[PDB]
Design a protein around this ligand. Sequence first.
Ligand SMILES: [Cl-]
Length: 129
Amino acid sequence: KVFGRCELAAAMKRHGLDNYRGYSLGNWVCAAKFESNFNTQATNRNTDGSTDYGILQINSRWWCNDGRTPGSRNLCNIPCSALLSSDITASVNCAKKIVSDGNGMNAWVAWRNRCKGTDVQAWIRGCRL
Ligand SMILES: [Cl-]
């Protein structure tokens, strides 16, 4: 599913991501924009052989099981395919664990490089929330 901007903002808010670990909704929407262009089915292979899945490009090295990432963990206790669903519950629940891991949203390199410190409120402008 390719979400609309405000559609994703609303779904993220419904799932409790708004101000989760102190990160406003705009931060989460910005991260999803640059990780996946709001596409739940986005996948990308990393240099180390791990793969990133879903709207927030969650990595199989630590967070989910894809059966092909040696020595990896599955800390969200989910198949990576769950992160590709039109229903964002699995991505959101796993993102909550990731953002709580110690480094906040810096875990998402694209957030650090493209969202952090910017006017992230623009990402939820116009949205009925
Ligand atoms: Cl990740």
